Every structure is written in structure tokens, then in C-alpha cells.
Design a protein around this nucleic acid. Structure first.
Ligand SMILES: Nc1ccn([C@H]2C[C@H](O)[C@@H](COP(=O)(O)OP(=O)(O)OP(=O)(O)O)O2)c(=O)n1
Ligand SMILES: [Ca+2]
Ligand SMILES: [Ca+2]
Length: 424
DNA sequence: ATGTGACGCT
DNA sequence: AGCGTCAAC
């Protein structure tokens, strides 16, 4: 029951939006800086932070004005605003630059604007057949950390010794050795990271392991500009002090009630329990999933899908700004449907496909829920006016208000989303 | 007053 | 289908 069949990697760009602005504006390079959204309210909402600024305590979600109190020198780049809304086109375009390069090595699954998983298994099998049965130089792994090593004098010093203990203990003439494969994946990943920095100027970190979750957790262990190998063997130690919240899926309510119901804190504590025990507690899927996972075993595959499955535009209208006339509602529906049209037209022309379903969603004041009503709609032509008129229609009936020019509760949110794509 | 996109459940 | 969860996009 190995869980060592695959070789999987998660690459994720270091402070991505910041790096995109720093490439464009050299003055921002090597400085405490952040990317900000909407400068009016409290200086703007910060959404990405360079590591220099992080050392001052500046975080995401922090108000730029508040960030400047921790960090007086903090430089700010501003998100482009089209049609009264934050537009992300520059980062989406920077994303496909990375995603394309990365595709040259293996098939990837776009996990976000910023990161992608890679199944390296096949590419690893092939590279061994040139290295018959030649070793692996530390020189081939210049930015790789081996989690748990060394065991048994300053930062880069220690990385080095861990790598050497790992390479020395390595069974090279055996080509089905899981640990050897991970090492081969790591060398490949060194290369794809060098290709990314060369051809884009962006730096990233990577995690190399046997499945998606380990890969991902491995990736954050040595950030930035570094990659980390997490082998099957290293899992009991890593997990034994690993807060459960840190594993992907378990950072919300399910994870919070793993802790609750079981009276544990770390992932390794899950091993005590039988698969049936966990199934009774969390469901059949969640029981099986946790039983394997706490032993470093996970089987979610790397889906072959480089591009998003939905395209969507939303805007919030908090408190005072909530929409209360219907001319107001119609105007933003149009703005949204406009950004959407252009994103969609680009998509049919770039990625050879058409969306067929339009999802409209809203929020009303006095409702803490993330939404308040989603309705679907046909999407027969990529016309902004039609879509905004159709979106209205599917929500026109959402009017508590008697007087026919005002809007019921004022609306806290509008969301338009293209979906159900088909080949063109 | 922080402001995309995937998938699970029923 | 419409709602919820998750992480982070
Ligand atoms: N809540 C969030 C999270 C992220 N992003 C955007 C800004 C980020 O730069 C990018 C990638 O998100 P990450 O969570 O990977 O964080 P960074 O890449 O900014 O930094 P790190 O080096 O910690 O990954 O997506 C955002 O707008 N809102
Ligand atoms: Ca990142
Ligand atoms: Ca990321």
C-alpha cells in the first residue's frame, strides 16, 4: 500500500502580482512593496506583498494606510481599473506565460492564477534511461531542500548537508526506487524553474512528492525561490508536529471538526484511527481520504486542464454603496457584461471554444451568506447588452420594493459568470 | 469596508 | 439546478 506510484510537483510563483509589477517597474525591485486594489477606501486593499515588506509585518487584506504604519517606505502598485472595476488582465496574461513554459515538460493542472500541479511520473521514467545507471550530482539540484535532512552551519550550509546525506543513501542502479524517482523529478523541476525565470524573469517555489497534497505542503516549506522534496519516509516526522489546518482541504470547518471530534492537533495523530472510525465521523469519502492522507497517501490525480472552466466577473457594493435604483443595477450589469464579453471573445479566439450558460448572482443587505440568489440563463451570443438585459430579467423579479424605480433591499453584490463551454 | 474559480451535496 | 465549502484565483 505504497502511495509512491506517482511523481507529482506543485509550482507556485513567489508573491506573484508583486513580481508582475516589479518586472514592469524596475523601481519596485528589491523593495518593500505591495499590490493594492481601490485606493479610495483606506488607501486601498492590499492583495500581494513582497517578502521585504513581509519582514515589516505587512499582509494581504491589510488596508494600505494601515500597512504604511508598519512600513513607512512601502511602495504601492495599483491594480488596473476598467469600467469602474478592478481588472486583472495583466496577471492573467502573465499567468499563461508561466503555464505555457511549464506545459513544455509535462501536462499540468492549473490550480490557480499562480500555481499548477505536474505529473512527472512518465518524464521521470524516460530520463533514467539516459542516466544508465549514472548517479545524480548535487550540482543538478542547486535549490533543492530535502525535508527532514540533515539528521544524526548556516542556512545554505545546512541545505547542502541534507542534500548530500540524501544523495549518498540513494539506490541508483534500481529504477523503481520511489526515492530515486523523487530525486529525478526534483532535477526536472530545477530545470523548469530555471526555464521560467529565464524566459519570464519570475521566481517561484516548488514542492516535489508522490501526490498533490504533499507536493503543495512541500512547496511552502522553503519559500521563496526554493524547492523542497518531501519523500514518503519523511512524512511521519513532518506530520507529527504539522497543524492539521495546513493540509489542503482541512483549513476550514471539516478540519476544525477533525480537531473538535477527535481531540487532536497534528496530522500524524490521525493514524491511531481505523478507516471505519474516520468514515463514521466524517463520511465515507472523507474517512477513506483522511486514513490514507495521514500516512502520506493520496490519489487525487493531476487533471489535464491548463485553462479555466468558467469565466466570471463580480463586484461588491458594501454598505453605503449598495445598489438601490434599478438604473444603478442596470448600469453595473452592463459594465460587468462588458468585461465579460471581452474576456469571452478573447477566449473563443485564443482557446477555441464557446460558453453556453450564463450564471447571474446577487446579494442583498441583511444577508451574511456569500450569495443570496444564483440563477442560470442561456448564453447564445457574446453580446454585452443582451447578457446584461438577460441577467436583469432573471433577477428583475427579485424586487421586494413596491415603488418601481427603487431597489428592494439594496444589493451588496453582482456576479456574472460564463460557463458550460463547448468546442469551437 | 477586503475584493476568482474549483468541486461537493442534494 | 442552486447552495455550500475551500483556498486563495
Ligand atoms: N486572497 C487572495 C489570494 C491571492 N490573490 C492573488 C494575489 C497573489 O499574488 C496571487 C497568488 O496568491 P498566493 O496565495 O500564491 O500568494 P502570493 O503568490 O502573493 O505569495 P506567496 O509567495 O506567499 O505565494 O493571487 C488575491 O488577489 N487574493
Ligand atoms: Ca504564490
Ligand atoms: Ca498560489
Amino acid at each position: 500500500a505504497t502511495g509512491q506510484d506517482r511523481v507529482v510537483a506543485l509550482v507556485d510563483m513567489d508573491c506573484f502580482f508583486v513580481q508582475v509589477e516589479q518586472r514592469q517597474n524596475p523601481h519596485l525591485r528589491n523593495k518593500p512593496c505591495a499590490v493594492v486594489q481601490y485606493k479610495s477606501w483606506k488607501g486601498g486593499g492590499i492583495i500581494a506583498v513582497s517578502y521585504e515588506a513581509r519582514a515589516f509585518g505587512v499582509t494581504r487584506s491589510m488596508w494600505a494606510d494601515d500597512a504604511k504604519k508598519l512600513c513607512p517606505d512601502l511602495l504601492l502598485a495599483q491594480v488596473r481599473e476598467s469600467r469602474g472595476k478592478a481588472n486583472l488582465t495583466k496577471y492573467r496574461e502573465a499567468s499563461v506565460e508561466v503555464m505555457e513554459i511549464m506545459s513544455r515538460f509535462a501536462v499540468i493542472e492549473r490550480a490557480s492564477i499562480d500555481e499548477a500541479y505536474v505529473d512527472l511520473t512518465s518524464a521521470v521514467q524516460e530520463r533514467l534511461q539516459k542516466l544508465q545507471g549514472q548517479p545524480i550530482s548535487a550540482d543538478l539540484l542547486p535549490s533543492t531542500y530535502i525535508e527532514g535532512l540533515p539528521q544524526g552551519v548556516q542556512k545554505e550550509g545546512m541545505r547542502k548537508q541534507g542534500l548530500f546525506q540524501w544523495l549518498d543513501s540513494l539506490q541508483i542502479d534500481n529504477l523503481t526506487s520511489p526515492d530515486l524517482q523523487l530525486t529525478v523529478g526534483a532535477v526536472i523541476v530545477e530545470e523548469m524553474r530555471a526555464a521560467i525565470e529565464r524566459e519570464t524573469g519570475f521566481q517561484c517555489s516548488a514542492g516535489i512528492s508522490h501526490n498533490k497534497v504533499l507536493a503543495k505542503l512541500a512547496c511552502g516549506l522553503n519559500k521563496p525561490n526554493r524547492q523542497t522534496l518531501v519523500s514518503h519516509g519523511s512524512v511521519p516526522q513532518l506530520f507529527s508536529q504539522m497543524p492539521i489546518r495546513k493540509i489542503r482541504s482541512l483549513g476550514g470547518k471539516l478540519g476544525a471538526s477533525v480537531i473538535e471530534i477527535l481531540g487532536i492537533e497534528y496530522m500524524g495523530e490521525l493514524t491511531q484511527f481505523t478507516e471505519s472510525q474516520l468514515q463514521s465521523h466524517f463520511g465515507e469519502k472523507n474517512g477513506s481520504w483522511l486514513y490514507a492522507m495521514c500516512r502520506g497517501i493520496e490519489h487525487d490525480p493531476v487533471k489535464p486542464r491548463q485553462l479555466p472552466k468558467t469565466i466570471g466577473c463580480s463586484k461588491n457594493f458594501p454598505g453605503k454603496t449598495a445598489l438601490a435604483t434599478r438604473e444603478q443595477v442596470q448600469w453595473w450589469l452592463l459594465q460587468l457584461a462588458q468585461e465579460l464579453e471581452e474576456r469571452l471573445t478573447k477566449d473563443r479566439n485564443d482557446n477555441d471554444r464557446v460558453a453556453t450558460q450564463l450564471v447571474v448572482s446577487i446579494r442583498v443587505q441583511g444577508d451574511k451568506r456569500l450569495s443570496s440568489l444564483r440563477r442560470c440563463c442561456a448564453l447564445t451570443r457574446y453580446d454585452a447588452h443582451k447578457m446584461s438585459h438577460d441577467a436583469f430579467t432573471v433577477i428583475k423579479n427579485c424586487n421586494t420594493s413596491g415603488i418601481q424605480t427603487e431597489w428592494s433591499p439594496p444589493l451588496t453584490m453582482l456576479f456574472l459568470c460564463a460557463t458550460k463551454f463547448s468546442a469551437s
